[PDB]
Structure formats: structure tokens, C-alpha cells
């Protein structure tokens, strides 16, 4: 879970936790991601900057 | 607490009390013609300037002495409401503090000018001259 407080109007974003120990260990956990980091506006001009 | 040669205790040895500045003056609500705020009723109408109105019942009010009350009522009859209260207002500032302050000074000035007799009539302004002359004509017209 995110250690900082997510804004109430935004729901968290999530991803599959994986392990490199084995070839098939593609899902061992489920991780929350802060929406304000991993769900920002798709601003490709700022990426260009 | 650190203290230095310029600490207020050393600069002013007599007033070394911790609460000397923060006390409230003893009496002083009687002398200097203090106006009792509680008696007055204050309403702020935001007319841009925030107008302030101070109104009180002149005759009933006892803080003003009766001899002053009679003179004030005659002198400033135009400012007395039908209810008998004396209505004075100020609209010269955007801060109601000064508007209230201007209103209060009018009360103090009105009391003071009534207390002191205005013996001097001063010079007769053209407005007074016109008023006097037209009055004389009315008298002469009514020779009947």
C-alpha cells in the first residue's frame, strides 16, 4: 500500500508484483501505486522537454 | 532570561512590575467625558465605503447631564429620529473603525459645544445675510 495519503477523489493504481527467482514467478503479489505518480496526465511534450 | 544594560527594568527602574504595561487604568471611565459604549447601539451598513451609524435616545440617556441634553436636542433637532433617538452616521472611509471613530467624535464635540456657551456670533456670512434680509422683507410685507 502507498505510504503517503492518496487524494480521496482518485482511486489507487495497481500492478502485479513479480519475482525473478523462477521463470514462472510472474505474480506473487499485488501492489498499490500512488495515482499522482503512475496515473498523471499523458504529457508527451513535457517528456520531450 | 538574558538581560542587558538596556533592559526595560534598568532603563525604567520604577516600572519594574511585570504587569505595569498590561494593567487597565484605574477609573478613567468617568473623567475625560467617557462615552458609555454599551448604551450606544452600533449598526454597520456597507453602503465603496462601509457606513457606520450610532443611535441613542437623547432624552432618556442619563450619562449626558440634563442641561446638556436640552441644548443638544434644540441645536441638533435635525439629527433626532421620530423615535427620539439621535442618529449620526459616517461614510468617509472604507474601514468601519474610522467611520465609528468619526461618529463617536461627533458625540464628544456635540456635548462639548453645548457645555461651553458660544458667546461669539462671528462675522455674518452671505448665507446669513440673505436669510436676514429676506426675513426683514417678510416683516415689512406684514405691516397689516
Amino acid at each position: 500500500k502507498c505510504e503517503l495519503r492518496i487524494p480521496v477523489h482518485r482511486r489507487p493504481v495497481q500492478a502485479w508484483v513479480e519475482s525473478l527467482r523462477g521463470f514462472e514467478q510472474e505474480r506473487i503479489g499485488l501492489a498499490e501505486l500512488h495515482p499522482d505518480v503512475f496515473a498523471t496526465a499523458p504529457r508527451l511534450d513535457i517528456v520531450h522537454q | 532570561t538574558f538581560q542587558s544594560i538596556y533592559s526595560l527594568d534598568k532603563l525604567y527602574p520604577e516600572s519594574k512590575g511585570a504587569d505595569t504595561a498590561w494593567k487597565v487604568p484605574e477609573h478613567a471611565k468617568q473623567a475625560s467625558s467617557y462615552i458609555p459604549l454599551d448604551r450606544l447601539s452600533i449598526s454597520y451598513c456597507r453602503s465603496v465605503n462601509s457606513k457606520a451609524e450610532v443611535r441613542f435616545h437623547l432624552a432618556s440617556a442619563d450619562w449626558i447631564e440634563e442641561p446638556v441634553r436640552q441644548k443638544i436636542a434644540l441645536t441638533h433637532k435635525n439629527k433626532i429620529n421620530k423615535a427620539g433617538e439621535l442618529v449620526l452616521t459616517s461614510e468617509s472611509s472604507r474601514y468601519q473603525f474610522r467611520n465609528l471613530a468619526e461618529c463617536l467624535q461627533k458625540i464628544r464635540d456635540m456635548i462639548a459645544e453645548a457645555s461651553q456657551v458660544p458667546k461669539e456670533p462671528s462675522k455674518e456670512d452671505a448665507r446669513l445675510q440673505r436669510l436676514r434680509i429676506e426675513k426683514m422683507n417678510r416683516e415689512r410685507l406684514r405691516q397689516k
Binding site: 499523458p42 511534450d45 | 532570561t1 538596556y6 505595569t20 498590561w22 463617536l104
Partner: protein, 287 residues
């Protein structure tokens, strides 16, 4: 956010797909084509076309406009005038409401600077903050605040609500330390003494009606009551107030910080304060 769903459909973002924001770049024009070549925008041959026109302000030989006007001392002594950043009661209430200034403790220039309520530039001749009457009507906070200058209306608002205001003088060296204490501490010097006002400002800071820090405390009660009568409010007896100890707190005329005496050394690294023991130094700092 449907826009993020669009990214899912599109090809990978990479260094080959980058594009600037539209209209972020103008075109640079070189004098190569016929349009901007040839005479290249300089006109027919002459002094201007060869690049040697007279300097700015030259009017072709007649006495220029900026020279025919008489000299007058508009800006005489400008760099030596003192400037005071204006802080209005409206801004002060806004800072208090949003928690950027703590009304429980006394307010000095350090607290205003820490909360970003005011921006001080000592290098640009700032001598501190002046209380400004704007917002007085809607000020409803009980505060203990120290400022360099104050107005009659601003003082009235502070006192009416039950707070205390005093006017105190800080010299240019003291002001920089007060605004930015931590950078000073890292230098490793002992805290310096606070210089008294220049002779011009001595009358201001020794007057009770201005709440001067060098003024006689015995004359404060009369001055405080006078404002109450003038501005139509009842003076509140602050001694009864539970927070009287905080409200009454005032720094010594030679002290920059509330609990730190002149001459101490702040060892931030080890969380210690070092105090001198030499008698001659103590006489110097105690003075």
C-alpha cells in the same frame, strides 16, 4: 482517465517519437533566399545599413531630450532609504487561518518568513515588516506580534481582539540573521548583539503610542486606553487571559532570538549550545 487508455492502444513512447508542444518553437530566418537575402533587411546603403548609426538617445546633433531636462533630486539618497515590507491584517488572517502562522506562540519576523507570509530582502534595503491597516474590519485573532512599524488602525485591531503588538528595531546585520537564522548558525560564529536604533528612529521606538520596544512600560496603559475610546471598543484586561505569559513575552533590546543570549554559539551538528566563560567577553555581550 480515458487519455491513459489511449496510450495503451498507441505505439511505445521512445526517443524516436518525441515532439515539442505545438507552436513552442519559432523559425529562425537566415539571409539566404531572395525574401530575406539581398539587402538582408537593412535597407539601402547608409550609416544604418553599414551598422554604424549613433548611440541610443542621440537625436542627430540637437541637444537630446534626456539632457535638456533639469537635474532634480528625485532619486537622491535612494539607496540609503529604509524599506519596510507591508503586511496587511488581511494577509495575516489568511496565514493564521491556513495554519502557516501559529497564533499560540509569539510572532516575529522569523515566523512570518518561515511560513512564507512575507519575503524579506535585506540586501535590497529592507528593514523589516510594517503592519498595514488593510483587513482590520475582518481581523478576529488574538495574537502577539512584533513588527518594525505599525499604524494606529492596525494597532487598534490587534489590541481590540486581545492581542499585543510592539514595534522593534533590527539593524541590517541583525535583520539578515533574524530572517535566515540557520545559515548563520552554520558559520560557527557567536550570536551578535543587536544595535540600538539610529538617532533618527530613537523617538519612534521610545514612544508608547507606537508601542516602541524602548518606550516606557508605565505609559502603555494610558496609550492603550486612548485607542479604545477613540475607536469605540472596550479595552480587554489581558492579565486575566490564560495565555498572558505568552502575550507579555518581549525580547531584550539587545537580543535577536527569544531564548538565545548574545555571544552564544549554536552547535547544530551535536545539538548543543556553547556559552563563553571569559569575563571580558561576558561584559561585552551583556552590554
Amino acid at each position: 482517465g480515458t487519455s491513459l487508455d489511449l496510450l495503451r492502444s498507441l505505439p511505445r513512447v521512445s526517443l524516436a517519437n518525441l515532439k515539442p508542444s505545438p507552436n513552442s518553437r519559432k523559425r529562425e530566418r537566415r539571409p539566404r533566399d531572395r525574401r530575406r537575402g539581398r539587402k538582408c533587411g537593412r535597407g539601402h546603403k547608409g550609416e544604418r545599413q553599414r551598422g554604424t548609426r549613433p548611440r541610443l538617445g542621440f537625436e542627430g546633433g540637437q541637444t537630446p531630450f534626456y539632457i535638456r531636462i533639469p537635474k532634480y533630486g528625485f532619486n537622491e539618497g535612494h539607496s540609503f532609504r529604509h524599506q519596510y515590507q507591508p503586511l496587511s491584517l488581511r494577509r495575516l488572517q489568511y496565514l493564521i487561518d491556513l495554519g502557516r502562522v501559529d497564533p499560540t506562540q509569539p510572532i516575529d519576523l522569523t515566523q512570518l518568513v518561515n511560513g512564507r507570509g512575507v519575503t524579506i530582502q535585506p540586501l535590497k534595503r529592507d528593514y523589516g515588516v510594517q503592519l498595514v491597516e488593510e483587513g482590520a474590519d475582518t481581523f478576529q485573532a488574538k495574537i502577539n506580534i512584533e513588527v518594525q512599524l505599525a499604524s494606529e488602525l492596525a494597532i487598534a485591531a490587534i489590541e481590540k481582539n486581545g492581542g499585543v503588538v510592539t514595534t522593534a528595531f533590527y539593524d541590517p546585520r541583525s535583520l539578515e540573521i533574524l530572517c535566515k537564522p540557520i545559515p548563520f548558525f552554520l558559520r560557527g560564529q557567536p550570536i551578535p548583539k543587536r544595535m540600538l536604533p539610529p538617532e533618527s528612529l530613537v523617538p519612534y521606538y521610545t514612544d508608547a503610542k507606537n508601542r516602541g520596544y524602548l518606550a516606557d512600560p508605565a505609559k502603555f496603559p494610558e496609550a492603550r486606553l486612548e485607542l479604545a475610546m477613540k475607536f469605540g471598543y472596550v479595552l480587554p484586561d489581558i492579565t486575566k487571559d490564560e495565555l498572558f505569559r505568552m502575550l507579555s513575552a518581549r525580547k531584550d533590546p539587545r537580543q535577536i532570538f527569544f531564548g538565545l543570549a548574545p555571544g552564544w554559539v549554536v552547535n547544530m551538528a551535536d545539538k548543543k549550545i556553547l556559552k563563553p566563560t571569559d569575563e571580558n567577553l561576558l561584559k561585552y555581550y551583556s552590554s
